[PDB]
Amino acid sequence: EWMPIEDLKLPSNVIEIIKKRGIKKLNPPQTEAVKKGLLEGNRLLLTSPTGSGKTLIAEMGIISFLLKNGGKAIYVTPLRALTNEKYLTFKDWELIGFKVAMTSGDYDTDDAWLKNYDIIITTYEKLDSLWRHRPEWLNEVNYFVLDELHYLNDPERGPVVESVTIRAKRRNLLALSATISNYKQIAKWLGAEPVATNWRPVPLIEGVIYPERKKKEYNVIFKDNTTKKVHGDDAIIAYTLDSLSKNGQVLVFRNSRKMAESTALKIANYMNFVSLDENALSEILKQLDDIEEGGSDEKELLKSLISKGVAYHHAGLSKALRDLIEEGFRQRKIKVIVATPTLAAGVNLPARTVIIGDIPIMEYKQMSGRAGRPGFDQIGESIVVVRDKEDVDRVFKKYVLSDVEPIESKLGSERAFYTFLLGILSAEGNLSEKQLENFAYESLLAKQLVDVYFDRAIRWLLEHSFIKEEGNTFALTNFGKRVADLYINPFTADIIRKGLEGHKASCELAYLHLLAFTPDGPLVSVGRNEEEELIELLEDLDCELLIEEPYEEDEYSLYINALKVALIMKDWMDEVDEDTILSKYNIGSGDLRNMVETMDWLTYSAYHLSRELKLNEHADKLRILNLRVRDGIKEELLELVQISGVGRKRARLLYNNGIKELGDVVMNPDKVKNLLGQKLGEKVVQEAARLLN
Numbered sequence: 001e002w003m004p005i006e007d008l009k010l011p012s013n014v015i016e017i018i019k020k021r022g023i024k025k026l027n028p029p030q031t032e033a034v035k036k037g038l039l040e041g042n043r044l045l046l047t048s049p050t051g052s053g054k055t056l057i058a059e060m061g062i063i064s065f066l067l068k069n070g071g072k073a074i075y076v077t078p079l080r081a082l083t084n085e086k087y088l089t090f091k092d093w094e095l096i097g098f099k100v101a102m103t104s105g106d107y108d109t110d111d112a113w114l115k116n117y118d119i120i121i122t123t124y125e126k127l128d129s130l131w132r133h134r135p136e137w138l139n140e141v142n143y144f145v146l147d148e149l150h151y152l153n154d155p156e157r158g159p160v161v162e163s164v165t166i167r168a169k170r171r172n173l174l175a176l177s178a179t180i181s182n183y184k185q186i187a188k189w190l191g192a193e194p195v196a197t198n199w200r201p202v203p204l205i206e207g208v209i210y211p212e213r214k215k216k217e218y219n220v221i222f223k224d225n226t227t228k229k230v231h232g233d234d235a236i237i238a239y240t241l242d243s244l245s246k247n248g249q250v251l252v253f254r255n256s257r258k259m260a261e262s263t264a265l266k267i268a269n270y271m272n273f274v275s276l277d278e279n280a281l282s283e284i285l286k287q288l289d290d291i292e293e294g295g296s297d298e299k300e301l302l303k304s305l306i307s308k309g310v311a312y313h314h315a316g317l318s319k320a321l322r323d324l325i326e327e328g329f330r331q332r333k334i335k336v337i338v339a340t341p342t343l344a345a346g347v348n349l350p351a352r353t354v355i356i357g358d359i360p361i362m363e364y365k366q367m368s369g370r371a372g373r374p375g376f377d378q379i380g381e382s383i384v385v386v387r388d389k390e391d392v393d394r395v396f397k398k399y400v401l402s403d404v405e406p407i408e409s410k411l412g413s414e415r416a417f418y419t420f421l422l423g424i425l426s427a428e429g430n431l432s433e434k435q436l437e438n439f440a441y442e443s444l445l446a447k448q449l450v451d452v453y454f455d456r457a458i459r460w461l462l463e464h465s466f467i468k469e470e471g472n473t474f475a476l477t478n479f480g481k482r483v484a485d486l487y488i489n490p491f492t493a494d495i496i497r498k499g500l501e502g503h504k505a506s507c508e509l510a511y512l513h514l515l516a517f518t519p520d521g522p523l524v525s526v527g528r529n530e531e532e533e534l535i536e537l538l539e540d541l542d543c544e545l546l547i548e549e550p551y552e553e554d555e556y557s558l559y560i561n562a563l564k565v566a567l568i569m570k571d572w573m574d575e576v577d578e579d580t581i582l583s584k585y586n587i588g589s590g591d592l593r594n595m596v597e598t599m600d601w602l603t604y605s606a607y608h609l610s611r612e613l614k615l616n617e618h619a620d621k622l623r624i625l626n627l628r629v630r631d632g633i634k635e636e637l638l639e640l641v642q643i644s645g646v647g648r649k650r651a652r653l654l655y656n657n658g659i660k661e662l663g664d665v666v667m668n669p670d671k672v673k674n675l676l677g678q679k680l681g682e683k684v685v686q687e688a689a690r691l692l693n
Contacts, residue, residue, distance in 0.1 A: 041143070045187040072140045078123060103121070114500070200369075365597060516565035
């Protein structure tokens with residue numbers, strides 16, 4: 001059914017704020033949610049496809065709860081790009097006097113300023129981090145929206161999703177998810193009423209393409225036994241050009257970055273007959289060239305493609321580059337994107353046709369569900385590429401006709417479980433064995449598996465002195481509590497402490513290496529010849545490393561991996577041009593920025609662990625390392641970048657013009673406005689003085 005929004009049991013200006021968005025009526029699942037007492041605050045597990053308007057369901061849940069009860073509400077979602085989306089939507093509610101905020105990116109804080117906000121948008125790790133800190137304002141959050149709850153199944157994020165969910169269960173919650181096959185089992189664990197739907201704003205047809213005798217001919221078989229023939233160089237290109245001739249947009253999923261790039265260039269070649277908005281594209285090309293936060297070769301490659309209506313998309317690309325591609329496609333100017341599977345998990349972005357090139361079942365569902373533009377297409381189509389007719393049946397049975405893999409807890413590991421118990425102790429304070437165990441059973445993990453990991457974890461945390469016994473009770477050590485607050489894995493913290501206590505102050509490469517080696521450290525791909533050069537380098541290093549060379553092969557690869565990361569970070573710090581760094585190490589602009597962000601967090605955390613462990617020489621090296629990694633600057637620039645609005649670029653400009661110190665800024669305010677501009681120049685001189693004061 002489709003409920004009119006004027007029938008909604010809410011105040012009038014609330015209904016109006018919904019209606020200003022060009023909505024006359026609720027969707028079927030939104031209507032369904034209301035019928036099941038969304039507005040009364042019943043605990044619901046709502047599952048549905050991508051563009052089903054679940055954001056409005058969350059908004060209605062939160063606003064209704066806040067209106068009927070005191071306090072605060074939280075919306076939590078896995079990806080920062082999804083938090084930023086939701087934040088902009090929720091800001092509409094500042095009209096009825098609700099104050100909306102996003103939690104900060106820092107883990108080592110309680111975000112106490114949130115006491116003045118009513119609606120709070122966060123990610124799972126940040127919320128998990130917040131509970132460990134026990135801030136007053138969190139006691140006032142009585143209603144939680146848990147979005148993308150199917151992330152319980154994710155090996156990396158799942159255990160964090162569970163920790164948050166567990167604490168939410170003690171209050172009020174709304175859970176929203178992609179399809180969950182064991183949704184009854186999950187709802188029961190959640191104590192929610194399940195509300196599973198299949199509805200889509202746009203019908204979908206699922207197909208499978210395959211080759212036959214004549215080499216440029218392909219047969220497409222659909223779910224309803226529809227049959228279609230297409231012609232072309234390969235299955236991808238043949239179906240792509242078929243879809244573009246009916247005013248379509250096509251999304252092609254490849255498994256690797258290079259494959260998405262080469263597949264995109266291959267399609268570009270055939271874009272002869274497709275109508276393209278050339279005036280709008282020369283504009284996007286203009287915007288592309290002036291992006292400074294991205295690589296030149298990336299820009300060069302994308303330019304070649306976007307002038308032909310095509311682009312690739314992967315995580316190798318910087319954020320600014322991914323945003324322009326996404327937005328170009330959102331406006332239907334870019335006709336084809338070839339992506340790795342990651343796009344399928346990101347913000348809303350549908351096409352007319354989805355082509356899956358490299359065929360787990362969930363990834364299929366998430367890719368295929370992007371087929372169909374809600375206000376534009378009458379029908380969407382996804383097709384899976386197969387290599388022979390005698391494989392069409394296995395695809396349909398496994399991907400098309402079957403449900404997703406059940407959700408099962410990912411807490412069943414030593415990493416996840418040591419972290420889980422450390423968090424519980426930080427959040428709850430001192431606990432008996434029995435009390436702590438009782439919390440661990442709140443987990444979605446089968447009891448039999450909980451029991452396997454629980455005592456395993458207790459003794460490890462005792463041996464490595466994260467916890468201590470005081471009689472009937474367990475308590476975090478001073479170190480254990482600092483680690484919990486920094487939000488680094490206990491295994492990471494253990495490696496760092498071992499490294500710092502085992503060796504004297506070393507060089508910056510060595511600290512970077514140690515931190516990269518940790519479970520929380522970055523991983524980078526390493527070439528085969530490159531690995532050999534790195535092994536040779538280890539034989540030539542004057543600097544001592546803070547970790548012994550591993551004897552086990554898998555551990556040794558990690559050791560070498562950490563050295564590549566260390567070397568990248570060091571070039572970054574030494575202000576080597578980005579493009580030089582990207583080519584030298586065969587990494588993307590997006591890879592460099594991810595790595596920097598992680599190493600900033602890890603160097604920051606190491607500094608504080610070092611201060612906790614009273615290792616002052618190490619701590620002084622780690623403090624400078626952090627400030628160097630953070631801005632990618634030589635030590636000479638540290639004083640300058642302190643100024644709000646002076647980054648590395650404006651600091652570099654200043655330093656080379658003889659302005660080396662904050663006092664140089666204060667005393668040459670004419671030459672500051674000459675270099676930075678009047679208005680920004682003015683503020684920069686203000687900050688320099690108050691900093692010195």
